[PDB]
């Protein structure tokens, strides 16, 4: 063919429900290859003002090829619906896994953190900042490996970021200057938080109210429980630094002792 | 249903260079309407990888009808060029004007700040945050009425149930996203009255540093009331900056604007 059509796919069980439609299991007829076909209702999308967000999500993700990133193979659409052709992740989200096992041993944690850091190093390599990563957006491939799969708040970094900032500098506010210097480093906080959630089974800054959680994060108020080892305390402490710049680099997270020691 | 084509216009003289192509004066052959035609070259946009920044700035601007914002009426594209059909601003830029007068009087500045604040209100009322405004991006219509012209840094505004995972810097600065446009106004106000922006310095590093420390000074001729205004706008914490209504009502503005 040239273009995808819905008629290329046998369609199996629903793999779950999203905001704007449902994900199905599916098979391409001519090669019998198994994938997931995500279905998004144009009506609900246009009523929620997220067409451009979707566009960004599909464009960004379709250009990433990495074992720890979920493949988006293609899209197409008909009068009512937009269809995404994604790699199928057999073993569920990390969220569901986390809440059966309560928390993970350090072997799993380090493994996932390594898998994550590789994925973000690659994203960064190709000028993409992933932003909101939570367990729900982490799926599991056949051999147990992480696949990042949201990109809902993912942005292409403007390139020439020293030159393009420098020159309009007089005019932009502190917020905007810091925003664009270290937006990169936002992905390091996320590793820290997640690593913490993996060992402990709940994020560092959980609270009754959004306002407290907000003060907690704002002041970096967290404490480890006893069973968390020094190597872990060390790594998370380094990742959860208030001032973006003091956070390590992905290169230093790969090299870190506690990681190498437990990463399989 | 009928769609723009290149031979719907008489291509006149150039109005400027620009990074990825040129802006020409032009006339719509049927209606005789004088407009401005911005021509960009696909092969340069692809090489710089700025097509999505173009798309966004065109999507955003073309859905903005306001006396103080440059109308972009439409676009089309042939095999090699992209064309943007813009309102035509005869009297050049506020950058030229400011060089030719060195600085502006209270009456001109308050008037210009009123037009910026109105255009900015409208923008926000459409969930659009302008972000970066230089005087180079501020053109003048044929009554010298002010026209916001660049939108390269502008974004469309949306939130949570997900903060547990957000860093402080995305938490803050964002969800105080309006107040970025208030800073810009403070800098323009200072600049119009004084001749140059308040954080200008030898080095980018001197400058940057000044911006964070919010270290500036007022020349002796800047009136108490302009200072008041400028000082509320240039606040470190976006929370403490006023709203665009408080700017339009501020007594110094109403005291000096040639017109509301």
């Amino acid at each position: 063919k040239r273009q995808w059509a819905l008629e290329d796919f046998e369609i199996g069980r629903p793999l779950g429900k999203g905001k704007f439609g449902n994900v199905y299991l599916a098979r391409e007829k001519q090669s019998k290859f198994i994938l997931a076909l995500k279905v998004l209702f144009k009506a609900q999308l246009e009523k929620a003002g997220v067409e451009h967000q979707l566009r960004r999500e599909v464009e960004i993700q379709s250009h990433l090829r990495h074992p720890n990133i979920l493949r988006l193979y293609g899209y197409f659409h008909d009068a009512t619906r937009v269809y995404l052709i994604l790699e199928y992740a057999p073993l569920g989200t990390v969220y569901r896994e986390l809440q059966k096992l309560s928390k993970f041993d350090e072997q799993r944690t380090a493994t996932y953190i390594t898998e994550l850091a590789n994925a973000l190093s690659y994203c960064h390599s190709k000028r993409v900042i992933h932003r909101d990563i939570k367990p729900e957006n982490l799926l599991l491939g056949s051999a147990g490996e992480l696949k990042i799969a949201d990109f809902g708040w993912s942005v292409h970094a403007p390139s020439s970021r020293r030159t393009t900032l420098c020159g309009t500098l007089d005019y932009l506010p502190p917020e905007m200057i810091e925003g664009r210097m270290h937006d990169e480093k936002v992905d390091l906080w996320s590793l820290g938080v997640l690593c913490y959630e993996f060992l402990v089974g709940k994020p560092p800054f959980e609270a009754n109210t959004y306002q407290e959680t907000y003060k907690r994060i704002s002041r970096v108020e967290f404490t480890f429980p006893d069973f968390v080892t020094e190597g872990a305390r060390d790594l998370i402490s380094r990742l959860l630094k208030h001032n973006p710049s003091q956070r390590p680099m992905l290169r230093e997270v790969l090299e870190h002792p506690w990681i190498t020691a437990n990463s399989s | 249903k009928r769609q723009w084509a290149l031979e719907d216009f008489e291509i006149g003289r150039p109005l400027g260079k620009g990074k990825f192509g040129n802006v020409y004066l032009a006339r719509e052959k049927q209606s005789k309407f004088i407009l401005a035609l911005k021509v960009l070259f696909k092969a340069q946009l692809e090489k710089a990888g700025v097509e999505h920044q173009l798309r966004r700035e065109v999507e955003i601007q073309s859905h903005l009808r306001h006396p103080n914002i440059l109308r972009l009426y439409g676009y089309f594209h042939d095999a090699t060029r992209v064309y943007l059909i813009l309102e035509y601003a005869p009297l050049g830029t506020v950058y030229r004007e400011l060089q030719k007068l060195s600085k502006f009087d209270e009456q001109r500045t308050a008037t210009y700040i009123t037009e910026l604040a109105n255009a900015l209100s409208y923008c926000h009322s459409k969930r659009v945050i302008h972000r970066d405004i230089k005087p180079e991006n501020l053109l003048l219509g044929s009554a010298g009425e002010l026209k916001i012209a660049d939108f390269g840094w502008s974004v469309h505004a949306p939130l949570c149930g997900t903060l547990d995972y957000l860093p402080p810097e995305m938490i803050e600065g964002r969800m105080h996203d309006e107040k970025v446009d208030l800073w810009s106004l403070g800098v323009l106000c200072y600049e119009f009255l004084v001749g140059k922006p308040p954080f200008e310095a030898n080095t980018y590093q001197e400058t940057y540093k000044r911006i964070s420390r919010v270290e500036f000074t007022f020349p002796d001729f800047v009136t108490e009331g302009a200072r008041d205004l400028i000082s509320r706008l240039l606040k470190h914490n976006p929370s403490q900056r006023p709203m665009l209504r408080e700017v339009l009502e501020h007594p110094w503005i109403t005291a000096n604007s040639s017109k509301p």
């Binding site: 273009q3 599909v58 193979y73 293609g74 899209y75 | -």
Partner: peptide
């Protein structure tokens, strides 16, 4: 409103490369 994304829309032979 037009659903044209600078993203792949073409059929893939999955048995290949």
């Amino acid at each position: 409103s037009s659903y044209s994304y600078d993203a792949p829309s073409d059929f893939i032979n999955f048995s290949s490369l």
